[PDB]
């Protein structure tokens, strides 16, 4: 393969086929799919870290879409990468404007 030789789980050949057959350029230089697969794997781990932490804090073994949305909105840079983005079955952060009380 190429994944064990790069130190990756993610499929380098799948990523490279999409770089050529996605029409992004004439030619694609063979470090590109390994550097890209590593970034996709890193970002995958960065979501799953905070989503696994959320699943544990929500007392669950299985990651549901709630845990993905909460992980993405708990972190500024995930929310900045994912600002226009929205998640199926995700909900919102708990937030009430502090003027709203029984009084």
């Amino acid at each position: 393969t190429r994944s064990s030789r790069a130190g990756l789980q993610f499929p380098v050949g799948r990523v490279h086929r999409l770089l050529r057959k996605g029409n992004y350029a004439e030619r694609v230089g063979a470090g590109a799919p390994v550097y890209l697969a590593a970034v996709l794997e890193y970002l995958t781990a960065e979501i799953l870290e905070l989503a696994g932490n959320a699943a544990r804090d929500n007392k669950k073994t299985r990651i549901i879409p709630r845990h993905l949305q909460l992980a993405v909105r708990n972190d500024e840079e995930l929310n900045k990468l994912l600002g226009r983005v929205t998640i199926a079955q995700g909900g919102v952060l708990p937030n009430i404007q502090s003027v709203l009380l029984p009084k």
Binding site: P65, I96, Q97, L100, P102
Partner: protein
């Protein structure tokens, strides 16, 4: 007894922010979908997943909208959202003219 007006709304906000369930009844939504689509093309089928996707985007858009809305109300010092807030909201987003 009687809960003071506004007390249970706070309770309900907590309930709905905590939950990720869909808030529009899916058959009334789906019938309005097929109407709006009909307007575009006749004799159209829709995947169940296709409807959901419209559903999820529509519900999430309105919540964020209401988010932003409620802000425009409190910017006028109001608690009550009014059509002017939405209007200003959209306006600023540059959706509406």
């Amino acid at each position: 007894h009687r809960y003071r007006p506004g007390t249970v709304a706070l309770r309900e906000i907590r309930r709905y922010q905590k939950s990720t369930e869909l808030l529009i009844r899916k058959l009334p939504f789906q019938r309005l979908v097929r109407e709006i689509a009909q307007d575009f093309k006749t004799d159209l089928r829709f995947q169940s997943s296709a409807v959901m996707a419209l559903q999820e985007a529509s519900e999430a858009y309105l919540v964020a909208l209401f988010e932003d809305t409620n802000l425009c109300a409190i910017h006028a010092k109001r608690v009550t959202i009014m059509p002017k807030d939405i209007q200003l909201a959209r306006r600023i987003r540059g959706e509406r003219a």
